[PDB]
Amino acid sequence: ETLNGGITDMLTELANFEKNVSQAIHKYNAYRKAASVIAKYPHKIKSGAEAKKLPGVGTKIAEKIDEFLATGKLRKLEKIRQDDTSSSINFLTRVSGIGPSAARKFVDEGIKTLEDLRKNEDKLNHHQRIGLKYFGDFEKRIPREEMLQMQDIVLNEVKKVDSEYIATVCGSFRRGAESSGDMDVLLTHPSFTSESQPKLLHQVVEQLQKVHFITDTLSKGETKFMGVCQLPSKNDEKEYPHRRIDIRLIPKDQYYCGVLYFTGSDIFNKNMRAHALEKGFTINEYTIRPLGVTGVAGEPLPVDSEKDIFDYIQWKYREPKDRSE
DNA sequence: CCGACGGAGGAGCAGG
DNA sequence: CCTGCTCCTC
DNA sequence: GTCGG
Ligand code: NA
Ligand code: NA
């Protein structure tokens, strides 16, 4: 199970409410931040005062923990769950393309279920229809061995379009995770820099649709594709679940800052650019830049690999498998 | 107290 | 044609 | 909702 999972489930459920119903994004991250640090906490919380010591748990969450520990539930949560409007709004946001704004409008005009969504196709946009059509699959995890094939098809199909493309599958997968939520692909080409072939991403997408790897399109422009993919059925067995795949085209001079940022983790990203500051550097997802007598960032530094970023700030290179914080 | 909390590409709209 | 807005995504 | 300044 998990030492404190009853508490972290309570917080995560509260986070979804603030995000989906209240439209309080910062409260959503507050509950998420508290849920994270408590999931890492290697003891089993016996009081709200104990949890309040941790960074991210404050007065209000400590009192809710005192109540959950004493009675086994949270009344704020109990009243929210039996409120039919709040929870229907919550549920509809699980459809890709339906955020908190669209979810409330739907529930306002009597639309509360997937069945209601299917009876009202006229009121959905293209993204929302694809999210509805694949509602079940998109909530399924991707086992690592399925990522490996998907990765193999992607890089192989990419190389066939041009040997000069470079593609890196990032996310938790690159750190060696047993499963992935989606597939996130970072693409670049030497002919695309910041001081700068006009269909570089389209040609790679075209090829993936042609071998019927990419099945649908959620959004697509010159630098960012968000769509749907599916592995080919072995022909002995049942077909695979449709999966989400994003493909970003990044200038070559910003590629490995991107690969590093979208590899993560978000904690490691936080710590890495923390260290960078103590050494006189600033890193975002695009560049690493020097500071800066008064604190002004200078011109981007040349980066040919991930290790160049580690070397500038004088950090020992760390494998993606060792970058979970 | 009191402001910050990641933030930009693309879809879909308004409007110049 | 263009910019600029919310919304959604990650 | 929480934190740091
Ligand atoms: Na605290
Ligand atoms: Na959604």
What's the per-residue H, E or C state across A70-96? HHCCCHHHHHHHHCHHHHHHHHHCCCC
Report the CATH number that the domain containing residue A98 is assigned in CATH: 1.10.150.20
Beta pairing partners, A183: A245
Do A159 and A214 belong together in one domain?
A: yes
Stated resolution in angstroms: 2.4
Q: If DSSP codes are grouped into helix, strand and coil, which group holds residue A192? A: coil
Beta pairing partners, A187: A167, A249
CA of A304 to the centre of ligand 1 (A): 41
Q: If DSSP codes are grouped into helix, strand and coil, which group holds residue A213? A: coil
In angstroms, how far is B3 C1' from A10 CA? 28
The experimental method behind these coordinates is X-ray
Beta pairing partners, A246: A184, A226
- Say if residues A300 and A252 touch (Cβ distance below 8 Å): no
- What is the number of other CB atoms lying within 10 angstroms of the CB of residue A32? 19
- Nearest of A204, A249, A251 to residue A229 by alpha carbon: A204
CA atoms A252, A254, A260, A265: torsion sign: negative
Question: Which domain covers residue A308, as residue numbers?
Answer: 262-324
Do A284 and A185 belong together in one domain?
A: no
CA atoms A50, A54, A60, A65: torsion sign: negative
Number of structural domains in chain A: 4
Q: Consult the annotation and say whether A172 binds a ligand.
A: yes
- Residues of A known to be catalytic: 64
